[PDB]
Ligand binder design. Structure first.
Ligand SMILES: *[C@@H]1O[C@H](CO)[C@@H](O[C@@H]2O[C@H](CO)[C@@H](O[C@@H]3O[C@H](CO)[C@@H](O)[C@H](O)[C@@H]3O)[C@H](O)[C@H]2NC(C)=O)[C@H](O)[C@H]1NC(C)=O
Lengths: 50, 49
């Protein structure tokens, strides 16, 4: 004679931590690196004529 | 509470704690606790160059 409706969001197996103002460390469902650390080690002749 | 038995007060440590935790750690995060520097540039002179 009654029904229950609920709302919610998704989740992932193992999330990633991020640095935020309020919390010193917290996990999210997705992240991304904003600092290029890797390098091919070779100079690409193009476009700039080398 | 203002029940028939009278009045009374009690602080909820749970809620209070959450606030404190967020507050404390933030400062150090935003600003780096420290950074070293040694020989730099003369930031003063006595004559014109
Ligand atoms: C995290 O969630 C995001 C969004 O749901 C997903 O990552 C995103 O993945 C797409 C496709 O792999 C990337 O877009 C691509 O952009 C390039 C731009 O040159 C384009 O050539 C491709 O056709 C494509 O549209 C997008 O950059 C990427 N964003 C990031 C870094 O999150 C992904 O499902 C989850 N994991 C990742 C990879 O972060």
């Amino acid at each position: 004679s009654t029904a229950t409706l609920c709302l919610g969001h998704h989740a992932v197996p193992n999330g990633t931590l991020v640095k935020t103002i309020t919390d010193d460390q917290i996990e999210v469902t997705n992240a991304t690196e904003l600092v290029q650390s890797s390098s091919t080690g070779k100079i690409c002749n193009n476009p700039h004529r080398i | 509470h203002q029940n028939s038995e009278g009045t009374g007060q009690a602080a909820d440590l749970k809620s209070t704690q959450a606030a404190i935790d967020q507050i404390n750690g933030k400062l150090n995060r935003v600003i780096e606790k420290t950074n070293e520097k040694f020989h730099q540039i003369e930031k003063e002179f006595s004559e014109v160059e």
